[PDB]
Amino acid sequence: GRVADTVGTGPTNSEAIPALTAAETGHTSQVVPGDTMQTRHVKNYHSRSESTVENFLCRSACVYFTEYKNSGSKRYAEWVVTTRQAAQLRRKLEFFTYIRFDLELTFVITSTQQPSTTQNQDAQILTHQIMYVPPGGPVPDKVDSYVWQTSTNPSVFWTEGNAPPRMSIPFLSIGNAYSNFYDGWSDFSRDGVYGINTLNSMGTLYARHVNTGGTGPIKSTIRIYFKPKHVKAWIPRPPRLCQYEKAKNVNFQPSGVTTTRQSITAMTNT
Amino acid sequence: GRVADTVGTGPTNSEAIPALTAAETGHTSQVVPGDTMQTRHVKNYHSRSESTVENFLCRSACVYFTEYKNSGSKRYAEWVVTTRQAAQLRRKLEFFTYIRFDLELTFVITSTQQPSTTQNQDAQILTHQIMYVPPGGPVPDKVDSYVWQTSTNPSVFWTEGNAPPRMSIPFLSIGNAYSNFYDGWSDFSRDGVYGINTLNSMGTLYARHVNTGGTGPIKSTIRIYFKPKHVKAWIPRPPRLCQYEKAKNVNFQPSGVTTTRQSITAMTNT
Amino acid sequence: GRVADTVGTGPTNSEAIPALTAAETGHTSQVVPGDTMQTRHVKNYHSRSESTVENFLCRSACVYFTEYKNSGSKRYAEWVVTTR
Amino acid sequence: GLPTMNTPGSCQFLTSDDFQSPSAMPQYDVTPEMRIPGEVKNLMEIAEVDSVVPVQNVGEKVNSMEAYQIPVRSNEGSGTQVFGFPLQPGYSSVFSRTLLGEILNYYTHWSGSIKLTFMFCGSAMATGKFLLAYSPLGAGAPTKRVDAMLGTHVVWDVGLQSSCVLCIPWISQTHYRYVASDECTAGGFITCWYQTNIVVPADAQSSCYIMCFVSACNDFSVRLLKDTPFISQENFFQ
Amino acid sequence: GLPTMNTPGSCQFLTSDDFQSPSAMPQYDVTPEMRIPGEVKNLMEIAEVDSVVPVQNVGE
Amino acid sequence: GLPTMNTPGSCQFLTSDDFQSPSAMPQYDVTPEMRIPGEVKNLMEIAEVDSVVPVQNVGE
Amino acid sequence: SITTPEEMIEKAKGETAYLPCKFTLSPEDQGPLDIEWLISPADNQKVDQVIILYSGDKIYDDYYPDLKGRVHFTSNDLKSGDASINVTNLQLSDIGTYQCKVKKAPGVANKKIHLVVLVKPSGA
Amino acid sequence: SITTPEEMIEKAKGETAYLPCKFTLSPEDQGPLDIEWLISPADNQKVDQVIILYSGDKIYDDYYPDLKGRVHFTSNDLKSGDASINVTNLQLSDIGTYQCKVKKAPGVANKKIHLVVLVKPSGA
Amino acid sequence: GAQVSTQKTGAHIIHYTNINYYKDAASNSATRQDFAQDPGKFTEPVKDIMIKSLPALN
Amino acid sequence: GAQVSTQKTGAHIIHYTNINYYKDAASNSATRQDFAQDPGKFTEPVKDIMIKSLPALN
Amino acid sequence: GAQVSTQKTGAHIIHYTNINYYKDAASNSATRQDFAQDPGKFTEPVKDIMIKSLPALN
Amino acid sequence: GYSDRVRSITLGNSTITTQECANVVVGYGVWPDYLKDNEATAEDQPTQPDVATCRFYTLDSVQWQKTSPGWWWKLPDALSNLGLFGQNMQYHYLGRTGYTIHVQCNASKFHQGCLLVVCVPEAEMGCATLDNTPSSAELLGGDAAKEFAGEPIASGSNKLVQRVVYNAGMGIGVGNLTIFPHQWINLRTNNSATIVMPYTNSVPMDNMFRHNNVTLMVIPFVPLDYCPGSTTYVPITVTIAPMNAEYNGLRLAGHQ
Amino acid sequence: GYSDRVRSITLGNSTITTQECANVVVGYGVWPDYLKDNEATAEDQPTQPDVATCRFYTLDSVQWQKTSPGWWWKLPDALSNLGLFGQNMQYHYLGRTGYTIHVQCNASKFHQGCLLVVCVPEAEM
């Protein structure tokens, strides 16, 4: 894991020309300082461990959050699982064309009492259900549906005040890797929406209150955190320059290649 | 556990007729693609581990839930233990004629304050009792009965806010297996209710509040989750087509064998 | 811990009278079905583990309960320990 | 006390967890096991058994035995179509209620080859030849016999051996396909055509019926358990 | 701290549980055991003893 | 019960933690790995590749 | 539960109807036995009215002035599994739906009998 | 989602506009299908008004008195992925923005069409 | 100083581990696997043995 | 008395540890790694073996 | 079946213990100590090797 | 020479021959046998009558009409009035048996049709009235065949079986009945079906009057057809032989 | 058992079965094979497509009437518009092939008639 040492070199007068090459060939020069100047010998101990692909990707990030109430219209939350709605993790993943990983999911669930006129509020403690529906499974259309029975769908039940709930998911693709980019169509006539496949289909998450607590209104928020683990990745790419616009495509607004300075010899930015 | 490889085959001209057989015999043909076309050789690594009977059955499912209050008329809950009141788990079990399993029971208990006019509500924390009465044991007829003394009946006591209570139950039949189907009677004159035996008798569960909390009214709900473990099963059956009607019998409303399409060459459903 | 097997027996005609005894003596007869009828042989695997004195007695039971308040007259509870 | 630290996940109830737990019934002695015929170890053992396909699932025919019957007859020509349906073993209404289909609807992914057995059920005096064809996706379903002939197919000659097997081999860009309907993992087409006619002598019926059966090959498997869309409920039964 | 995770069932009181627990009376010295006649190990030992049947259990 | 004592840090969620956790999908069989060209093990492998500098970054 | 919980019985005026209610107990059912018969008359808009009760070892008649002295239990031993009743001297004004309710905790069962009384004695 | 969610279409008075709404389903989308078409007219300040609905296996017309009998679905089989509509006998007072809303839980998609109707038949 | 012992299982072996944590025997868990029996002190408490195939009184 | 066993992994091994804590077998965790199969009792339940390359009836 | 491995330390070795608790590999902790590198597929992807002291084109 | 189309089966004082057969299906691979010492629970010495009861009994014939939905027979009960098998059923608490089932139907090379022959363990059937369960007379044909129906049985306040054929009286899809042991009688190939069925139950022995543990079903999937001038009466005929029969618990005769 | 009346023939992604056949005639005793080095004259490396072109193609059917005189098909040309065999015919100066020909006609035990099936080299008409 260590970085390379510096070989000490003395003066030189010869036909060897390490510093002259031809960039046309597609080759990157392997020159070191000793090729073009006198250097001392250095015993370098610095390490490259913090820039492995795993260490670069393996931190928790919030990919999405939403809300649901204990009364009224929106009694449960519903989210198609994806990495493309939050900028910071999407950008890190799109350094690579193809990638395999497992996931650690952590949920941060919090609640807030809402303004009301109801007197004598003595709410009991709230439990929450989170259900994961794989693609193709039937989905709940109301907070009191037989679907929440979860005979075969994994569900986590969690009571407020305890540690946040967490579970692992294996690499889940029908392909040999997830594809971050797809230059093509799903329909053989190419008259459809471009860039859409189902190699990244992961399913849907539903969240509800199991009990209502008390007589007052209460709104909860669920934040979903993805941490990739056991990562393998292929075919590095230029990082995303333009700001993201849509979750389902790469559409952008054009922008300059960097920011400006005053003149070609100016030593500061503008 | 792996699936079988594909043997590569070349062209053929002979008296061997692997693709001609006689379905009359009750035998299912053992043909593979190499019998009827040229194939390459494939090293298949796919596994069948997710369709073992154990992995197919060993997930928690809610079989039943009910409610009880801290005041008023219905002060405790009472449930004869069975798998036949919830559709999803019943259907999975009825793939098989006979089956042995152990159980893991998990209880999800939650409470809600009910509307009232009482002022100054300062309720203390609620503890709950769940009692299991084997068949033949005396049963409580009021929330304050000597039966809740539980000298020999297993009971779990549980305070709200902690992790959900859980316990294991061994295979409990007087027979050598549970029977999912019984084509007969319990009385020797066959003038009784058809399809009733006591090979699946498991007992009764009772649940109550130990303390009342505060001066306000509070309703709790107990959800019961069954997970089978250590499964053995025999004599597979056609899966249930018609919707379930009753808990204690197989009675159905007739229905077609599938849904329709427009014509015998139509490529889509209707 | 297992229970006893059943020995298979055939017909009999003799002076042996296992089924006749005298209860006056205070003795309980040790007769088994093979003494008085033809029986097959049975390999019995049933166990007696759930009726040991320990397993019969070792369950939690509520022997007593009482009440006390945070104010007023009865501020503490007091109980002489007993099973009766 | 041994110094410990609780991690996230502490005190959750995850329905697919696998933990030990105390038994409510200490030292209870289970009834001994019996040797019962027909023990099942794996659901694929069921999938490999043939079951009858409801090919003629048109209108009111799903409320009778006619859904399982495929009509054939003596024609005044040749090469017309007998049936066609798509290779969607979990989602096509042709396949969804077979043994194979009912098992598939508890899973998210499927892979492997499939067998279709046909049994001719005319009189012994009837003869005929049939073309059974599978056409991989990308060009749509064939509409003539001369286009169906380009794909993978069997020419079935009816005789003393009454049944013929078409093997649908696994030809896919992915290792697995979805059970639900999905165009990125389209399966292709299955069709059947008159190769020659049905020919009978006088005093024999010129109309006849074929029956079709489906099962899985020894290379078949399923992934990712889920709930079936076929069973449902509005209240607890009684 | 050793990283741990509490499972469901944590902090319940199940009346047929079998757990260790700290004694309230450290190092107390129990009275020695005596050889008493009639020791019972199993309730079936009682069941195998004859007792008198009330066959004529009619009215008074 | 083994006598234990929870340390500070118990029940926190630290985003750079590295703990085991139960899988929601027991015994699921992942798609086998393929030999794909261009595998990346370390971000420095990217940094050592030449790219074009925008030196004349003045105005429009 | 009760053997045939849904049925219909046809008799003529002046004859006396047998309403069968035969039940079987489960081993779980260990509470005390309660037996209730109630009525919903066809002609009348009154509904769910007790006509005869059995509880705590004894019978209670005298709940429906109309059936006064004309509703009795048919078994010498009711708790063995027989809660059938006889109605006597039938007339048109009692055509309706009779309901038999048997309770023994945890178990609970009911049975509905639709009694039709016809003018002429004839099953057509 | 819907194929081309933003577009503009130009036709002449008396001709009949085709408003394409073609959609594709994801494997996650397993709820029941709902299809709504609403309108925001250019001349008028009324906004977001349903003109034609499809739900629970059947169509519902008769929501906009103005388009009475002149708004229909173009497909014999709508749930296969075609929710396009025809408007007929176009006049200036309907120039506006039409909106196609397709729902099948979890999935939801919409499409905006800006219909311009011109006096003379000419794309210039 | 762990002890390994057999679990209760069915008939047609699997083991479990224990370690005592406390200093008094009265803190240990219950003794649930003592299956010895001796009914002959209650049945047959007679001075002269009684052979079952013979007459009891002669 | 710990038991070490192999985890479920992918194809192109890593182990885990278990110790039983309770006195009954019914307290143990599930049996998820039993991958034996035997479909020949349901397919091919015929008295006379049927060789696939031959005619079924002769 | 514990595994002992080296911790990350400074330069101018100390060990840690792990035991897997679950039955699937996807439950294990991250793989943070894979320090292999191979930049020659991105730098220098040329058919003819290019010796640094020579002219690139001759 | 030899032919695998011919077969002879001899049991007790009876023998059956056939010249156009398919094969023989054996249960779930398991041939019938007496109960062993290490699986027995009843302690008395069993009687094993062995030729008086293990032999072929031929039931009443049944007509295959062009619209026939199909037939069923509950197995202990079908033979319950019939010979010393019936007498031993009547005098004993407990019984145990397997079966050899043989279904016969011949027709000319000019007739066509196809029957499924299946042996269904524990065929618990449904009532037309959802609250009720069917009466004994509706379920037990008793040496006479019971018939399926073509249309759904109307609901009343009755005790009739919900008889419609495409749900097999069991709320299932009838085409999936091939998971059970079975054969097809296809008139152009075959005039006989034979199934050897072992004892199947969740207990080692059972009462033979209270519980019917297997049910034979015979169902036409392809209807009988022929042309005028051909014979119109085509019967089906079932013959059943118990195998390895045993009985325990002798007492006075009856079932109540 | 066995019967010499049944036959299966598999080529590429196609297979043909028959239950009432006679035997198989092989040419002049010679089974088809690729051209060898010591008989070749064209020097370029040949393409050998091998399942894309060596497979069964079924032609349009023909009615046997009581007065039918008979039919003929010239062989390269019959397949010339048909699949990748046709495409490879269209893109190359030179080609070389053998054939498996299979002619099918069923009728009842009550029909009668007799057909000659012949393969004629160089049928100049």
Curated annotation (Swiss-Prot), chains G, H:
One of its GO terms (biological process) is regulation of AV node cell action potential. The keyword Cell membrane applies. Keywords: Cell adhesion, Cell junction, Cell membrane, Disulfide bond, Glycoprotein, Host cell receptor for virus entry, Host-virus interaction, Immunoglobulin domain, Lipoprotein, Membrane, Palmitate, Phosphoprotein, Receptor, Repeat, Secreted, Signal, Tight junction, Transmembrane, Transmembrane helix. Disulfide bonds join C21-C100. One of its GO terms (molecular function) is connexin binding. Expressed in pancreas, brain, heart, small intestine, testis, prostate and at a lower level in liver and lung. Isoform 5 is ubiquitously expressed. Isoform 3 is expressed in heart, lung and pancreas. In skeletal muscle, isoform 1 is found at the neuromuscular junction and isoform 2 is found in blood vessels. In cardiac muscle, isoform 1 and isoform 2 are found at intercalated disks. In heart expressed in subendothelial layers of the vessel wall but not in the luminal endothelial surface. Expression is elevated in hearts with dilated cardiomyopathy. N-glycosylated. GO terms for cellular component: acrosomal vesicle; adherens junction; apicolateral plasma membrane; basolateral plasma membrane; bicellular tight junction; cell body; cell junction; cell-cell junction. Residues 1-114 form the Ig-like C2-type domain. Glycans are attached at N86. Monomer. May form homodimer. Interacts with LNX, MAGI1, DLG4, PRKCABP, TJP1 and CTNNB1. Interacts with MPDZ; recruits MPDZ to intercellular contact sites. Interacts with JAML (homodimeric form). Secreted isoform 3, isoform 4 and isoform 5 can interact with the extracellular domain of the receptor. The Ig-like C2-type 1 domain mediates homodimerization and interaction with JAML. Component of the epithelial apical junction complex that may function as a homophilic cell adhesion molecule and is essential for tight junction integrity. Also involved in transepithelial migration of leukocytes through adhesive interactions with JAML a transmembrane protein of the plasma membrane of leukocytes. The interaction between both receptors also mediates the activation of gamma-delta T-cells, a subpopulation of T-cells residing in epithelia and involved in tissue homeostasis and repair. This is Coxsackievirus and adenovirus receptor. The chain holds residues 21 to 144 of 365 of the full protein.
